[PDB]
Design a protein around this ligand. Structure first.
Ligand SMILES: CCCCCCCCO[C@H]1O[C@@H](CO)[C@H](O)[C@H](O)[C@@H]1O
Ligand SMILES: CCCCCCCCO[C@H]1O[C@@H](CO)[C@H](O)[C@H](O)[C@@H]1O
Ligand SMILES: CCCCCCCCO[C@H]1O[C@@H](CO)[C@H](O)[C@H](O)[C@@H]1O
Ligand SMILES: [Cl-]
Lengths: 25, 25, 25, 25
């Protein structure tokens, strides 16, 4: 499976997209 | 192999690049 | 080992972040 | 475990987030 550090960076990417979308709305 | 979440973040990233390329063309 | 989609996105992220850093200098 | 390029991209993503925060400070 993926390294915790990689998991953490992917979560950061996903949250950033969600925050950006919420801001645009 | 890779965690679902990490695969999903990668697909978002690839889509992000496609969209940017399309915008610039 | 990593999913091939994850390696490909990582390589794109690296190039992107490299360009970002050069500009920030 | 995760490929070296995947680990590297994740670290560079974390570096970017931190440079972005410090930039605003
Ligand atoms: C603690 C983990 C939360 C990470 C989510 C916040 C990431 C915000 O950081 C981002 O702000 C962007 C604005 O769209 C800028 O374009 C920057 O490139 C930066 O990466
Ligand atoms: C998960 C990592 C995938 C990385 C995909 C890169 C997303 C491309 O998108 C970015 O392209 C840059 C130039 O290439 C532009 O300066 C913009 O910041 C754009 O958002
Ligand atoms: C800019 C900072 C980037 C640092 C990148 C370090 C990533 C390497 O890290 C990798 O090294 C491998 C050696 O082949 C080990 O086998 C480990 O699996 C590890 O993932
Ligand atoms: Cl991985």
């Amino acid at each position: 499976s993926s390294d915790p550090l990689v998991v953490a960076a992917s979560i950061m990417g996903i949250l950033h997209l969600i925050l950006w979308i919420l801001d645009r709305l």
